[PDB]
Amino acid sequence: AGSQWRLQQGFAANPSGYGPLTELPDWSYADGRPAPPMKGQLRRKAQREKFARRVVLLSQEMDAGLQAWQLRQQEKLQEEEGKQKNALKSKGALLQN
Amino acid sequence: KFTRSRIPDKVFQPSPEDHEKYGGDPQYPHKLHIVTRIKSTKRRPYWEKDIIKMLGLEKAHTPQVHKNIPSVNAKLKVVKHLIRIKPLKLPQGLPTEEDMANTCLKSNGELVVRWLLN
Amino acid sequence: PFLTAEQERGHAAVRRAAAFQALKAAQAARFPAHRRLEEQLGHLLVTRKWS
Amino acid sequence: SKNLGGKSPGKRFGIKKMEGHYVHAGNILATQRHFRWHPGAHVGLGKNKCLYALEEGVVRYTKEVYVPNPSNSEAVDLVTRLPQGAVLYKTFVHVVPAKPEGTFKLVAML
RNA sequence: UCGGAGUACAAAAAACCCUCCGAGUGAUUUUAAUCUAGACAAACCAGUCAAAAUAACCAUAACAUCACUUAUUGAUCCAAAAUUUUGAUCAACGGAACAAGUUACCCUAGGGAUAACAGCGCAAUCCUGUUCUAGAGUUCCUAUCGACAAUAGGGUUUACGACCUCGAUGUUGGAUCAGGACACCCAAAUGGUGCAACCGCUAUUAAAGGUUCGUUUGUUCAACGAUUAAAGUCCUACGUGAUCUGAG
RNA sequence: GCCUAACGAGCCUGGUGAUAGCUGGUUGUCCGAGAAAGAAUUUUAGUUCAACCUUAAAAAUACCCCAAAAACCCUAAAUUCCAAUGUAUUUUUAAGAGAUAGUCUAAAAAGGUACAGCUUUUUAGAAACGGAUACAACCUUGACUAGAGAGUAAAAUCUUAAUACUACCAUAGUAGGCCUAAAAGCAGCCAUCAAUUGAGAAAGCGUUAAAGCUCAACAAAUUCACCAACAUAAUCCCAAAAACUAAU
RNA sequence: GAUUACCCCUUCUACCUUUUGCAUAAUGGUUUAACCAGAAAAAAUCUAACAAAGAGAACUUUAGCUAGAUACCCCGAAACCAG
Ligand SMILES: Nc1nc2c(ncn2[C@@H]2O[C@H](COP(=O)(O)O)[C@@H](O)[C@H]2O)c(=O)[nH]1
Ligand SMILES: Nc1nc2c(ncn2[C@@H]2O[C@H](COP(=O)(O)O)[C@@H](O)[C@H]2O)c(=O)[nH]1
Ligand SMILES: [Mg+2]
Ligand SMILES: [Mg+2]
Ligand SMILES: [Mg+2]
Ligand SMILES: [Mg+2]
Ligand SMILES: [Mg+2]
Ligand SMILES: [Mg+2]
Ligand SMILES: [Mg+2]
Ligand SMILES: [Mg+2]
Ligand SMILES: [Mg+2]
Ligand SMILES: [Mg+2]
Ligand SMILES: [Mg+2]
Ligand SMILES: [Mg+2]
Ligand SMILES: [Mg+2]
Ligand SMILES: [Mg+2]
Ligand SMILES: [Mg+2]
Ligand SMILES: [Mg+2]
Ligand SMILES: [Mg+2]
Ligand SMILES: [Mg+2]
Ligand SMILES: [Mg+2]
Ligand SMILES: [Mg+2]
Ligand SMILES: [Mg+2]
Ligand SMILES: [Mg+2]
Ligand SMILES: [Mg+2]
Ligand SMILES: [Mg+2]
Ligand SMILES: [Mg+2]
Ligand SMILES: [Mg+2]
Ligand SMILES: [Mg+2]
Ligand SMILES: [Mg+2]
Ligand SMILES: [Mg+2]
Ligand SMILES: [Mg+2]
Ligand SMILES: [Mg+2]
Ligand SMILES: [Mg+2]
Ligand SMILES: [Mg+2]
Ligand SMILES: [Mg+2]
Ligand SMILES: [Mg+2]
Ligand SMILES: [Mg+2]
Ligand SMILES: [Mg+2]
Ligand SMILES: [Mg+2]
Ligand SMILES: [Mg+2]
Ligand SMILES: [Mg+2]
Ligand SMILES: [Mg+2]
Ligand SMILES: [Mg+2]
Ligand SMILES: [Mg+2]
Ligand SMILES: [Mg+2]
Ligand SMILES: [Mg+2]
Ligand SMILES: [Mg+2]
Ligand SMILES: [Mg+2]
Ligand SMILES: [Mg+2]
Ligand SMILES: [Mg+2]
Ligand SMILES: [Mg+2]
Ligand SMILES: [Mg+2]
Ligand SMILES: [Mg+2]
Ligand SMILES: [Mg+2]
Ligand SMILES: [Mg+2]
Ligand SMILES: [Mg+2]
Ligand SMILES: [Mg+2]
Ligand SMILES: [Mg+2]
Ligand SMILES: [Mg+2]
Ligand SMILES: [Mg+2]
Ligand SMILES: [Mg+2]
């Protein structure tokens, strides 16, 4: 078994997980030309590609959301400054002083 | 009567020793969750079943990547007793468009960008 | 969490709206299939013999 | 045996529209047996203590001071027996109108 | 049949041959209209609210009020009035226009969905032990008991439940043959006695073997006669009717 | 009672294929989805609606849902309504049938015996071809096919069987004062001083009353010392056995 | 399941029906052969004709009319009446 040992060493808990024992092709022609790809390997590649695409999409969405929040806060600061900039000069209690 | 459970806030306040115990950065929280359903949803309430279904954890022992935002953290808190949560680590950065088809997710949580080159 | 409740507000909403619109379009594309002359005329081939 | 008549269906005396709900005119906001929620702005009171919106808008719930009708002998007695610093408070349900009263539209140039 | 409070602690709903209050209307005048948005509730039938607009009164209200106000009520059809309305402890209260008792002379279709016997669950009841000593025992709790209380166990009685059987598990008692348990009646080995001896009273250990014959009663029991070393308590479909009896 | 072997009323024929909410049966393969009950009812052995569900079709929001909001004497688990977010589900339209006689487990309750494999409500779960030896409901488990591949899950002998406390001498005012036949530390009531380096007008046995035997007191050494242990059933006990070779 | 090998080894509580639940000691059957049990087109769905009209007569029509295909068992009483 040794799933805990394999997890500690970094390998998959199952010897059939992404190891070279399964990722590599298991046969080829005696002439040296490569064999057609395995259906299981093709499906695993498709799933890994989908997972990577999802990871990239999630990271990009999180970055975009953080940037949008920062931009909103900055625009709030700018409009708060502009409200004071567009005001008038006080004359009520300042002219008698 | 058996109903849902409200988890008190002090449960999710990490101790300073917990960061070193679980290998987390005390300053910067991680960006992405790797969630893997371990236990079954049978003999569990329908709300837990529905949360598992909407989290994409219908199949067991298949990791799924999620965000680290409170909106999904609420559901992960609801079904935290049926899942294993790890941080997604990226030693070689995000996979580029030229490295999408040569990536893999190790059991220890780092998503390698170049997996069995050549 | 990586983001706060105020920071996550509407960070991914266009994607959800687009997904719902795609679901609606997929549902609305439901309609009977085309009937072609080949389908009707291919039944006569059951009596093809050798001259 | 000795106890009879204890069976009677519930009257569904409760709250129908919560805070933030967009209601139209005439919608029953909440029904009650005793005065639990009091009507406020744009909320009328029926003969059976039910509360119905009079204008189309958004339902809100507030805590406000209670000044009873001076002709209400019981409430006036309660008020006059209240101590110096005591002010009554009640939960009032309001409807905040959304649409404007009307619009000025051009019809013809004469 | 209808309503209120608890069950049902905080939106709604929510049952019991569950615990308590009530209703089948009175008093008084303000005698309380038409039409229509939008809503509550709801299987359906029914029940509830209600803005704006209309005719009469202040030219500023009309939701009839009070009795916990919530319940004070009944569908079609059909009968009667003067055409507008009315009529049911139809209270078995979603109501058949008008109908009882008995059957052991009974019949049929089913039910272990549902009782009587047995089994099964529980131990209210019953039976065993120990803990606690106030009291009896002349004095002295524990030689013999031991109230008020505690705790553990067995499944003999009655009851409780209705889980297996109603396309059948045939009943009391007795005859024949008995298997088993020990919570031992005798026989055997002992401890304490308020054990001088004989008789006795308790407790410990032990289940290979025994545990009578008769009058009355169908009797299990019970009373009585004569004896015995003793005439034990129970379980076994209250053992045993494809072995027997039919007294009940 | 008897009326041609069955008479609470003969037999035959016809109505007649009587009628059964009741029982029994209901005949090829494969695939998709798939339901445990709210209201009426001479009704609870049944039907008709609602809620679920199936088959097609239109659409658009559907569950999860942070604030904020939902009563007045006290009140828990938590509910209702809601953005965001994660998913793709939901609502209407047209055809519809089955079901409406339920079990346990966890939780809040009620009745009972704070009894049931008991009965009635509310929330959740289950009804494995693995485990709990056997097993409905308990635990593990998003249920296809072939392989003489692999990794995991729940799960496989449970805790104590315990309670010893030993020498050493105890004299005095005085039989303290009252009651009493007697009350000398001791049926009883009140005082509770004092001699000795050290001993209570005495904390338990004992005498009718005395005597006498101990405790505390000094003198001698002084391992440790507060509570805790509790019978049994009936055909024949019930895997066998094992206290140390490295086990997250 | 296997196996060189019939058993010996390991694993599986007959089948319908009725039930909350049956290996149940709840019902049914010795076996074979032959017979023995879903039937209707109002509204609807699909297909097609023609279409403000459809139908070979009588009707229906604010996209409708005409035609076709999709649907609803068997056995059993005690009884009642007439001759
Ligand atoms: N009183 C009354 N009788 C009615 C009604 N509808 C039908 N009926 C029937 O009409 C008949 C009247 O006869 P009555 O009782 O007057 O002699 C009874 O059979 C009664 O049941 C009604 O609405 N009221
Ligand atoms: N009323 C009802 N009966 C069911 C349901 N599921 C199964 N049954 C009944 O249960 C029996 C079969 O049990 P099961 O095979 O489902 O364990 C059959 O009598 C079947 O009709 C249900 O969801 N509702
Ligand atoms: Mg595969
Ligand atoms: Mg009530
Ligand atoms: Mg009710
Ligand atoms: Mg409603
Ligand atoms: Mg008005
Ligand atoms: Mg009735
Ligand atoms: Mg009725
Ligand atoms: Mg009713
Ligand atoms: Mg007689
Ligand atoms: Mg019969
Ligand atoms: Mg039943
Ligand atoms: Mg009996
Ligand atoms: Mg019997
Ligand atoms: Mg019985
Ligand atoms: Mg039996
Ligand atoms: Mg009982
Ligand atoms: Mg017991
Ligand atoms: Mg005495
Ligand atoms: Mg017995
Ligand atoms: Mg039964
Ligand atoms: Mg029952
Ligand atoms: Mg029977
Ligand atoms: Mg039989
Ligand atoms: Mg014997
Ligand atoms: Mg003995
Ligand atoms: Mg003896
Ligand atoms: Mg014997
Ligand atoms: Mg008995
Ligand atoms: Mg017998
Ligand atoms: Mg026999
Ligand atoms: Mg007999
Ligand atoms: Mg015989
Ligand atoms: Mg006789
Ligand atoms: Mg005859
Ligand atoms: Mg018939
Ligand atoms: Mg019936
Ligand atoms: Mg299927
Ligand atoms: Mg129906
Ligand atoms: Mg909230
Ligand atoms: Mg929402
Ligand atoms: Mg029924
Ligand atoms: Mg039960
Ligand atoms: Mg349930
Ligand atoms: Mg099921
Ligand atoms: Mg098994
Ligand atoms: Mg599964
Ligand atoms: Mg001295
Ligand atoms: Mg001494
Ligand atoms: Mg004994
Ligand atoms: Mg079984
Ligand atoms: Mg059934
Ligand atoms: Mg049964
Ligand atoms: Mg049986
Ligand atoms: Mg059975
Ligand atoms: Mg039967
Ligand atoms: Mg059988
Ligand atoms: Mg059968
Ligand atoms: Mg048979
Ligand atoms: Mg037709
Ligand atoms: Mg007749």
PDB file of N, CA and C in Angstrom, chain B residues 15-51:
ATOM      1  N   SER B  15      -4.943  30.573  15.236  1.00  0.00           N
ATOM      2  CA  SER B  15      -3.920  30.849  16.230  1.00  0.00           C
ATOM      3  C   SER B  15      -2.581  31.117  15.547  1.00  0.00           C
ATOM      4  N   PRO B  16      -1.699  31.895  16.182  1.00  0.00           N
ATOM      5  CA  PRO B  16      -0.376  32.132  15.580  1.00  0.00           C
ATOM      6  C   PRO B  16       0.417  30.860  15.336  1.00  0.00           C
ATOM      7  N   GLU B  17       0.245  29.836  16.172  1.00  0.00           N
ATOM      8  CA  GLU B  17       0.920  28.563  15.951  1.00  0.00           C
ATOM      9  C   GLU B  17       0.305  27.761  14.813  1.00  0.00           C
ATOM     10  N   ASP B  18      -0.965  28.014  14.482  1.00  0.00           N
ATOM     11  CA  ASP B  18      -1.623  27.261  13.421  1.00  0.00           C
ATOM     12  C   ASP B  18      -0.977  27.512  12.067  1.00  0.00           C
ATOM     13  N   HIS B  19      -0.468  28.725  11.837  1.00  0.00           N
ATOM     14  CA  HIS B  19       0.196  29.024  10.572  1.00  0.00           C
ATOM     15  C   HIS B  19       1.398  28.113  10.357  1.00  0.00           C
ATOM     16  N   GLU B  20       2.245  27.969  11.379  1.00  0.00           N
ATOM     17  CA  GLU B  20       3.392  27.076  11.255  1.00  0.00           C
ATOM     18  C   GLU B  20       2.959  25.617  11.242  1.00  0.00           C
ATOM     19  N   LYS B  21       1.896  25.282  11.978  1.00  0.00           N
ATOM     20  CA  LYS B  21       1.444  23.894  12.020  1.00  0.00           C
ATOM     21  C   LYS B  21       0.957  23.424  10.656  1.00  0.00           C
ATOM     22  N   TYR B  22       0.217  24.272   9.944  1.00  0.00           N
ATOM     23  CA  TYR B  22      -0.386  23.897   8.672  1.00  0.00           C
ATOM     24  C   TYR B  22       0.360  24.460   7.469  1.00  0.00           C
ATOM     25  N   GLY B  23       1.499  25.109   7.680  1.00  0.00           N
ATOM     26  CA  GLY B  23       2.286  25.610   6.566  1.00  0.00           C
ATOM     27  C   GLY B  23       1.631  26.724   5.778  1.00  0.00           C
ATOM     28  N   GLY B  24       1.029  27.692   6.462  1.00  0.00           N
ATOM     29  CA  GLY B  24       0.415  28.819   5.790  1.00  0.00           C
ATOM     30  C   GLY B  24       1.149  30.121   6.037  1.00  0.00           C
ATOM     31  N   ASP B  25       1.012  31.070   5.120  1.00  0.00           N
ATOM     32  CA  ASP B  25       1.674  32.360   5.267  1.00  0.00           C
ATOM     33  C   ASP B  25       0.905  33.220   6.263  1.00  0.00           C
ATOM     34  N   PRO B  26       1.530  33.666   7.355  1.00  0.00           N
ATOM     35  CA  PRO B  26       0.805  34.502   8.325  1.00  0.00           C
ATOM     36  C   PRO B  26       0.370  35.848   7.773  1.00  0.00           C
ATOM     37  N   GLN B  27       0.982  36.323   6.688  1.00  0.00           N
ATOM     38  CA  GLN B  27       0.673  37.635   6.130  1.00  0.00           C
ATOM     39  C   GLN B  27      -0.339  37.557   4.990  1.00  0.00           C
ATOM     40  N   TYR B  28      -0.025  36.800   3.941  1.00  0.00           N
ATOM     41  CA  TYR B  28      -0.830  36.785   2.727  1.00  0.00           C
ATOM     42  C   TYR B  28      -1.625  35.494   2.631  1.00  0.00           C
ATOM     43  N   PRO B  29      -2.955  35.551   2.650  1.00  0.00           N
ATOM     44  CA  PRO B  29      -3.746  34.335   2.427  1.00  0.00           C
ATOM     45  C   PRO B  29      -3.589  33.833   1.001  1.00  0.00           C
ATOM     46  N   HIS B  30      -3.749  32.522   0.838  1.00  0.00           N
ATOM     47  CA  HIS B  30      -3.616  31.925  -0.480  1.00  0.00           C
ATOM     48  C   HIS B  30      -4.793  32.325  -1.367  1.00  0.00           C
ATOM     49  N   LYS B  31      -4.623  32.110  -2.670  1.00  0.00           N
ATOM     50  CA  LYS B  31      -5.554  32.611  -3.672  1.00  0.00           C
ATOM     51  C   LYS B  31      -6.629  31.608  -4.065  1.00  0.00           C
ATOM     52  N   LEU B  32      -6.291  30.326  -4.190  1.00  0.00           N
ATOM     53  CA  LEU B  32      -7.220  29.339  -4.723  1.00  0.00           C
ATOM     54  C   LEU B  32      -7.281  28.104  -3.836  1.00  0.00           C
ATOM     55  N   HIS B  33      -8.493  27.575  -3.682  1.00  0.00           N
ATOM     56  CA  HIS B  33      -8.745  26.345  -2.949  1.00  0.00           C
ATOM     57  C   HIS B  33      -8.686  25.151  -3.889  1.00  0.00           C
ATOM     58  N   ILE B  34      -8.124  24.053  -3.401  1.00  0.00           N
ATOM     59  CA  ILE B  34      -8.279  22.736  -4.002  1.00  0.00           C
ATOM     60  C   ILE B  34      -9.149  21.937  -3.045  1.00  0.00           C
ATOM     61  N   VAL B  35     -10.356  21.592  -3.482  1.00  0.00           N
ATOM     62  CA  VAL B  35     -11.343  20.928  -2.642  1.00  0.00           C
ATOM     63  C   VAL B  35     -11.579  19.533  -3.197  1.00  0.00           C
ATOM     64  N   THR B  36     -11.511  18.532  -2.325  1.00  0.00           N
ATOM     65  CA  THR B  36     -11.715  17.144  -2.713  1.00  0.00           C
ATOM     66  C   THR B  36     -12.692  16.498  -1.745  1.00  0.00           C
ATOM     67  N   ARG B  37     -13.830  16.039  -2.256  1.00  0.00           N
ATOM     68  CA  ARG B  37     -14.817  15.386  -1.405  1.00  0.00           C
ATOM     69  C   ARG B  37     -14.308  14.009  -1.001  1.00  0.00           C
ATOM     70  N   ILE B  38     -14.343  13.719   0.298  1.00  0.00           N
ATOM     71  CA  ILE B  38     -13.881  12.434   0.809  1.00  0.00           C
ATOM     72  C   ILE B  38     -15.083  11.575   1.170  1.00  0.00           C
ATOM     73  N   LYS B  39     -15.904  12.064   2.090  1.00  0.00           N
ATOM     74  CA  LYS B  39     -17.048  11.317   2.583  1.00  0.00           C
ATOM     75  C   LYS B  39     -18.216  11.406   1.610  1.00  0.00           C
ATOM     76  N   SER B  40     -19.160  10.486   1.774  1.00  0.00           N
ATOM     77  CA  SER B  40     -20.352  10.473   0.946  1.00  0.00           C
ATOM     78  C   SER B  40     -21.390  11.445   1.488  1.00  0.00           C
ATOM     79  N   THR B  41     -22.318  11.828   0.617  1.00  0.00           N
ATOM     80  CA  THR B  41     -23.437  12.669   1.008  1.00  0.00           C
ATOM     81  C   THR B  41     -24.614  11.869   1.549  1.00  0.00           C
ATOM     82  N   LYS B  42     -24.552  10.542   1.495  1.00  0.00           N
ATOM     83  CA  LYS B  42     -25.600   9.720   2.077  1.00  0.00           C
ATOM     84  C   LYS B  42     -25.576   9.832   3.596  1.00  0.00           C
ATOM     85  N   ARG B  43     -26.761   9.727   4.196  1.00  0.00           N
ATOM     86  CA  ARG B  43     -26.951   9.910   5.634  1.00  0.00           C
ATOM     87  C   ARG B  43     -26.548  11.313   6.077  1.00  0.00           C
ATOM     88  N   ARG B  44     -26.633  12.269   5.156  1.00  0.00           N
ATOM     89  CA  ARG B  44     -26.397  13.682   5.388  1.00  0.00           C
ATOM     90  C   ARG B  44     -27.600  14.468   4.891  1.00  0.00           C
ATOM     91  N   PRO B  45     -27.872  15.631   5.478  1.00  0.00           N
ATOM     92  CA  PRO B  45     -29.089  16.368   5.130  1.00  0.00           C
ATOM     93  C   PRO B  45     -29.089  16.867   3.692  1.00  0.00           C
ATOM     94  N   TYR B  46     -30.300  17.189   3.226  1.00  0.00           N
ATOM     95  CA  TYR B  46     -30.484  17.590   1.837  1.00  0.00           C
ATOM     96  C   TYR B  46     -29.775  18.898   1.521  1.00  0.00           C
ATOM     97  N   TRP B  47     -29.660  19.804   2.495  1.00  0.00           N
ATOM     98  CA  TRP B  47     -28.938  21.045   2.230  1.00  0.00           C
ATOM     99  C   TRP B  47     -27.453  20.778   2.006  1.00  0.00           C
ATOM    100  N   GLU B  48     -26.869  19.863   2.782  1.00  0.00           N
ATOM    101  CA  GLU B  48     -25.486  19.466   2.541  1.00  0.00           C
ATOM    102  C   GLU B  48     -25.339  18.781   1.188  1.00  0.00           C
ATOM    103  N   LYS B  49     -26.300  17.923   0.831  1.00  0.00           N
ATOM    104  CA  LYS B  49     -26.268  17.289  -0.485  1.00  0.00           C
ATOM    105  C   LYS B  49     -26.290  18.329  -1.599  1.00  0.00           C
ATOM    106  N   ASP B  50     -27.160  19.332  -1.476  1.00  0.00           N
ATOM    107  CA  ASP B  50     -27.276  20.359  -2.506  1.00  0.00           C
ATOM    108  C   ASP B  50     -26.021  21.219  -2.581  1.00  0.00           C
ATOM    109  N   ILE B  51     -25.420  21.540  -1.432  1.00  0.00           N
ATOM    110  CA  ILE B  51     -24.180  22.314  -1.446  1.00  0.00           C
ATOM    111  C   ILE B  51     -23.074  21.528  -2.136  1.00  0.00           C
TER     112      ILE B  51
END
